[PDB]
Ligand binder design. Sequence first.
Ligand SMILES: [Ca+2]
Ligand SMILES: [Ca+2]
Ligand SMILES: [Cl-]
Ligand SMILES: [Cl-]
Length: 285
Amino acid sequence: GMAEYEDRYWTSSDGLRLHFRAYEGDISRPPVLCLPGLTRNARDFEDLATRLAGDWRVLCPEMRGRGDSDYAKDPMTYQPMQYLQDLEALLAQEGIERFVAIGTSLGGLLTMLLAAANPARIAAAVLNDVGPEVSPEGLERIRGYVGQGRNFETWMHAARALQESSGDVYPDWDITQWLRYAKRIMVLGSSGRIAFDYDMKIAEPFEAPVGATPQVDMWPLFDALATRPLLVLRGETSDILSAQTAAKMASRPGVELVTLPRIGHAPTLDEPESIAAIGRLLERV
Ligand SMILES: [Ca+2]
Ligand SMILES: [Ca+2]
Ligand SMILES: [Cl-]
Ligand SMILES: [Cl-]
């Protein structure tokens, strides 16, 4: 079949071949950079990117250890400041000076970190279910599931396993929605088993457990981002971003908050309300 994207690569300082999907579009607008969550890859954006493509150029990178990006020989390089450096390397190598950033979870943190370097580089941004205060309930869950290593013979078994742990996050989903989600985050591997599509060594803590936020008040990073056009999406039931923190974010001038009913951490960005929200944000570029 024909794809809506082309497979592209860039090189990290330390020598990894890292992967991004590139979707062609309007060269007279800045490109849209989609940054996935901790355990996630370019497929989390596979539908959003097709809805934005043509009207926008869209880049969907995968961090080291995720998807088709190379795995690190040194798992201690699986940390947020390294991902930030790798994204700076992508931007340098592709000659991108100004861009829209759409960041989910850890991707939203990376979006704040990129903005901090020079907020004028951000044409506009979307933070998907993440903010400068992260709820401990959600962090506890992350520590618990990353690298736990469950694998399956069939997609149906995988899907049911995901519903068992995330049915509270997406209580209204049907089986087709669970299967679509499963294929975005898992892969049929070499051994014929379906497994999460990332290096299991990402779970190794080294100095701090996986998912740990930088040891800094992150309000300043949010506030610098919020000087640029900003949308914040929140799942109504999110265990990561509280309603209170989101309303504080929204109190900054120009920041629009959209809460997605009956879903938790995080909106898939395939919800009609999310799509429409992103469209409104993109008009402010
Ligand atoms: Ca760590
Ligand atoms: Ca309008
Ligand atoms: Cl199974
Ligand atoms: Cl991490």
